[PDB]
Design a protein around this nucleic acid. Structure first.
Length: 1099
DNA sequence: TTATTTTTTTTT
């Protein structure tokens, strides 16, 4: 055992010479420190290609962070402020976490500086003790030898308990052989459960007063059994754990440490970050559908339950009338803002009932979160969580507080789906009852992009490394338009100079041009004559090719037209490969595994391969169904071994899912079998070993791109609705399309019919190019190239790859070749930012439309809350002060829509009608316009009194000509009325009137209560009879004033009674001033104000 | 119309 004192004379300035991928990370984080500060998080997406140093420059960064903590601890050991920096390396694959851990451990041992070993052996053993790998509970238990668990069981006195020792004996006996797959599955279940129970006992023993003192061999055994113990102990910086294990959290001897709550300071390396969206999404919708009718049978929230039982009559059992709901349940879906659908029915009060119950439940969960914050480090946090729930009415409850910290918002706040989620409710008669029914509510409270932005906001310096980290899709990647809006400049990016420096590095390690490697791309069309000849030679005696496909290959007539197409393209690729003289190793990337389920197709393909092998005088080996089960049961080195030892060619039949990340395809070169066809495309080679990789590929079009979840039926619905709402949020779907897709997904949409609606976006094509960019990127992993690389592409991809228009600076050579070939025979691409502007304008208008309807309704439900009134006033003041803003505001974002013409736009729509039917920018050349000249803001602030008022209050005397303009709803319903109110308040105040806030009892019924000197009889103002009756019911005799901001001053003043009927001034109750300001010359209507003053004198 | 394979972790 060695200590940190070993680094006494170690020189921390002797760093290995950094490759242009290390300098990029160093410079980006050094810049991040200057811009954002030391204590701020970050998110640096790094598009590094696999195979040119992606994992060395990540583990060398981890090692430099490790060595920046030895220095800090040596310097600060006197001070004692030993808050360790938690370094994480997370990736979704267990096989990649272990591989990365072992690669770092080999990097520590083998790294040299200036030809000398970097670390003396004591420092090698010190640094390798800091690294803990955190596998799941089962593999963490089976990692433990008999001695470790014997010592732990004796040390905590758990050896004397017969149940624990019985379970441990059973586990040892099973592990002695562990051969059959079912045996190992049972052993894994057993190990997981026993580790659960053992760690529960350990945690209870440590939590109490009679604790165990851990030191020496017992501590070593606990730290072997519990690696998270070292992290809590302070004996390990670095954790190598998957994404799922990162979100779950790992155990230590006192609690379950969840890394998502102590991110302050964490340096987190997420490898293949874009893939984490699907993973984090799959753990977001793994929750359970928690019933609500049963739930509300279980301090102000107690009175709220009483009031719920008072109004919705909870004392009565809830029974549903009508049809039998169990044949097809009646469902309710709701994004928590502006999009709400349900199974076909005319409003069914169920929607309000279910929404009210879910509001009860969500407010209840928020109440526990606030109670925990009040009560209050994981030990104290979990103690608070356990204690608060421990009382009389919650004894039978679930206690799901932790998932909230692991995982609707008003205007005047940043509205987005990525932190409001979705709510889905399903109603059916309960198990074994017909009078009682259930409301199985399940919901998302964030999206994976919301989780990532929460992690970055919390302090974590996330460093996501993936060749397509910034792919422009939102279903197969994070929403980097939300992350840029939310995070701001904590979403780091590498500059243009750094991109071209990385590009120079990559070209230096892959110098195809100077060496003569030729990437030859061909796009394969389906040919019927080719396949018909091959089939009629496969079974000569059959009377037709369709007969061959129907009888022998087993293809029914319905799928025959599809099988012919994809089979014909694939066989064309194989023929073109085998005829290629010196190419040697092919990979076919289909969408389906050609396993035993497709054995007749395999027989035909192998027949054709043998045909062409004989014809062209080479021997070709085919590897059908190179599966995930195959690559586990039978190593991929069986291909490499064949290529290293036997002459000929190799055809490998894999899929897009099967060849995931970390499944390295290169083989070990033998110059006896390669000939003169291999050349080296690198300037300086880091190894004497010779290896080579794929040199022919077939790329079938990716088909099943809408990701789905097979965990459950209620987990598939949440995934599908998440994808629909993430497409609506990004602007890919209009609110019309998104709501039709949502309400059809409710009623039982197929998959072939959800997929056809995915295909109408441009997100789909970005996902297809993401699939094709990785497929050819995982093939080029070594610097020995053939003098000719064949790429065969499904012709369906030519029209999709031809539209790749991003910057070619980081594209691999193969993908550049694919896209350049696609372009040369393609096409005015329909701009996507333009369509996105239309869709987002419609969505912002719909959001403002429904939120204003709701807010005005709430203000009309007396009494009005202070939150609602303050939101109303915040919105009106924001629109008055900032009618148009330069940048999309973070906090008031859906009062605005981004226009195409700065300062104004055109629309047609019914502000009292359907928010989906709104049309907008030049798509409407003649329509209602939203401009300064329409609110007459120029005529209003030309008044002698109004302009000083608008200047003092800080309002806008004219609209700035900026891109973001108010939505039609905000312009019409709110802004113009705000201008009228401010103008009349300005004009009247200068004539010795005073204005005071309306009482909450009659808010929004009238503009303001106005108090004028000399009159104790109250007055009310309405500026642009039941309200009059109610106001006189509350406050007695009042005279109401109706005035306009501007208009015709020549009109006579109208004296009216309570019924809007003309009457004498002495009998006049409501005075109607046609215009306080002249519509033509902005002269104050002094005549009308004198009349009002005199009429109040004679009141 | 569109046409699939693939994981991970904790519990029950």
């Amino acid at each position: 055992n060695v200590s940190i004192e070993e680094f006494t004379h170690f020189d921390f300035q002797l760093v290995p010479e950094p490759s242009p991928l290390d300098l990029v990370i160093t410079e980006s984080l050094k810049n991040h420190i200057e811009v954002n500060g030391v204590k701020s998080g970050a998110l640096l997406p790094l598009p590094f290609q696999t195979g040119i140093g992606k994992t060395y420059t990540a583990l060398n960064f981890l090692l430099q962070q490790m060595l920046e903590q030895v220095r800090s601890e040596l310097k600060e050991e006197n001070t004692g402020k030993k808050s360790k920096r938690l370094l994480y390396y997370v990736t979704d694959s267990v096989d990649n976490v272990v591989s990365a851990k072992a690669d770092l451990l080999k990097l520590i041992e083998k790294q040299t500086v200036k030809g000398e070993p970097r670390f003396t052996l004591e420092q090698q053993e010190y640094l390798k003790a800091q690294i803990v790998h955190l596998p799941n509970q089962s593999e963490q238990l089976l990692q433990c030898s008999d001695a470790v668990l014997n010592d732990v069981l004796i040390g905590f006195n758990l050896n004397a308990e017969r149940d624990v020792q019985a379970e441990w004996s059973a586990i040892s006996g099973l592990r002695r052989h562990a051969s059959n797959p079912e045996v190992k599955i049972s052993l894994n279940r057993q190990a997981g459960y026993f580790y659960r129970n053992l760690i529960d006992r350990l945690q209870k023993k440590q939590k109490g007063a009679d604790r165990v003192l851990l030191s020496g061999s017992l501590l070593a055994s606990v730290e072997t059994l519990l690696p998270g113990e070292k992290i809590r102990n302070g004996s390990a910086h670095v954790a190598f754990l998957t994404t799922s294990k990162f979100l779950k959290g790992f155990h230590n001897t006192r609690s379950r440490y969840s890394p998502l709550r102590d991110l302050s300071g964490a340096v987190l390396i997420i490898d293949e970050i874009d893939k984490q969206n699907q993973v984090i999404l799959s753990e977001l919708c793994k929750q359970q559908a928690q019933d609500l009718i049963w739930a509300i049978r279980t301090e102000p929230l107690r009175e709220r339950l009483e009031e719920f039982g008072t109004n919705w009559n909870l004392a009565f059992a809830f029974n549903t009338e009508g049809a039998n709901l169990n044949e097809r349940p009646v469902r309710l879906f709701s994004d928590r803002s502006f999009t709400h659908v349900s199974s076909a029915t005319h409003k069914l009060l169920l929607t309000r009932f279910v929404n009210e119950a879910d509001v009860i439940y969500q407010w209840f969960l928020g109440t526990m979160r606030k109670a925990v914050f009040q009560y209050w480090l994981e030990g104290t946090f979990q103690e608070a969580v356990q204690s608060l729930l421990t009382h009389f009415n919650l004894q039978e409850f679930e206690s799901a507080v932790y998932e909230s910290f692991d995982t609707a918002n008003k205007l005047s706040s940043s509205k987005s789906y990525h932190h409001t989620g979705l709510k889905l409710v399903e109603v059916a008669h309960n198990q074994g009852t017909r009078d009682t029914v259930n409301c199985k509510a399940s919901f998302l409270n964030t999206s994976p992009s919301g989780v990532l932005a929460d992690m970055v906001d919390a302090g974590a310096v996330i460093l996501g490394i993936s060749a397509t980290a910034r792919a422009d899709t939102v279903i197969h990647n994070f929403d980097f338009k939300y992350l840029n809006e939310r995070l701001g400049n904590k979403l780091l990016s590498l500059s243009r100079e750094q991109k071209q420096r990385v590009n120079n590095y990559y070209h230096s390690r892959r110098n195809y041009k100077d060496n003569g490697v030729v990437l030859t791309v061909k796009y394969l069309n389906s040919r019927d004559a080719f396949l018909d000849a091959l089939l009629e030679e496969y079974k000569p005696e059959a009377r037709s090719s369709h007969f061959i496909l129907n009888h022998y290959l087993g293809i029914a007539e319905s799928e025959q037209a599809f099988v012919r197409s994809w089979l014909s393209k694939l066989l064309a690729s194989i023929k073109a490969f085998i005829s290629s003289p010196d190419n040697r190793y092919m990979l076919s990337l289909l969408n389906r595994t050609l396993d035993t389920t497709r054995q007749n197709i395999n027989d035909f393909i192998q027949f054709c391969c043998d045909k062409w092998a004989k014809e062209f005088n080479v021997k070709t080996k085919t590897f059908f169904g190179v599966n995930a089960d195959w690559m586990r049961l039978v190593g991929y080195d069986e291909i490499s071994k064949h290529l290293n030892t036997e002459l000929g060619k190799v055809v490998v039949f894999s899929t897009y899912a099967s060849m995931g990340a970390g499944k390295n395809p290169d083989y070990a070169v033998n110059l006896a079998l390669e000939g003169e066809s291999l050349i080296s495309v690198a300037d300086v080679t880091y190894s004497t070993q010779l290896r080579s990789d794929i040199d022919s590929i077939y790329l079938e079009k990716p088909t099943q791109l809408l990701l789905s979840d097979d965990y459950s039926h209620t987990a598939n619905q949440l995934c599908q609705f998440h994808q629909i709402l993430s497409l609506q949020e990004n602007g890919e779907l209009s609110p019309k399309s998104a709501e039709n897709w949502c309400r059809q997904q409710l009623m039982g949409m197929s998959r072939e019919r959800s997929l056809q609606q995915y295909h109408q976006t441009s997100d789909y094509q970005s996902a297809v190019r993401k699939y094709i960019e990785q497929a050819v990127g995982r093939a080029g992993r070594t610097s020995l190239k053939r003098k000719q690389i064949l790429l065969f592409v499904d012709s369906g991809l030519k029209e999709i790859l031809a539209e790749e228009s991003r910057d070619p600076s980081l594209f691999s050579h193969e993908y550049v070749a694919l896209v350049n070939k696609a372009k040369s025979a393609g096409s005015i691409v329909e701009d996507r930012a333009v369509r996105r502007l239309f869709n987002l304008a419609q969505r912002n208008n719909k959001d403002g439309m429904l939120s204003i309807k709701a807010l005005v309704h709430r203000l009309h439900n007396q009494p009005a809350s202070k939150s609602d009134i303050q939101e109303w006033q915040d919105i009106r003041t924001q629109l008055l002060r900032y009618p148009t803003v330069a940048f999309q505001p973070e906090r008031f974002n859906r009062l605005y829509l981004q226009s195409m013409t700065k300062g104004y736009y055109r629309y047609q729509g019914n502000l009292d009608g359907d928010p989906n039917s709104f049309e907008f920018f030049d798509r409407v050349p003649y329509g209602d316009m939203v401009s300064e000249e329409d609110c007459s803001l120029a005529t209003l602030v030309q008044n002698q009194y109004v302009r000083p008022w608008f200047e003092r209050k800080g309002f806008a005397c004219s609209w700035q000509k900026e891109a973001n303009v108010m939505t039609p709803i905000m312009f019409t319903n709110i802004y113009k009325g705000a201008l009228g109110e401010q103008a009349v308040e300005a004009v009247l105040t200068a004539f010795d009137f005073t204005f005071e806030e309306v009482p909450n009892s009659i808010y929004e019924r009238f503009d303001n209560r106005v108090i004028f000197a000399g009159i104790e009889q109250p007055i009310w103002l309405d500026s642009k009879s039941s309200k009059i009756a109610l106001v006189e019911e509350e406050f007695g005799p009042s005279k109401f004033i109706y005035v306009n901001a501007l208009g015709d001053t020549s009109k006579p003043i109208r004296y009216l009674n309570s019924c809007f009927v003309e009457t004498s001034p002495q009998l006049a109750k409501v005075i109607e001033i046609p215009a306080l300001i002249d519509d033509s010359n902005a002269d104050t209507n002094r005549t009308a104000v004198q009349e009002l003053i005199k009429w109040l004198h004679h009141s």
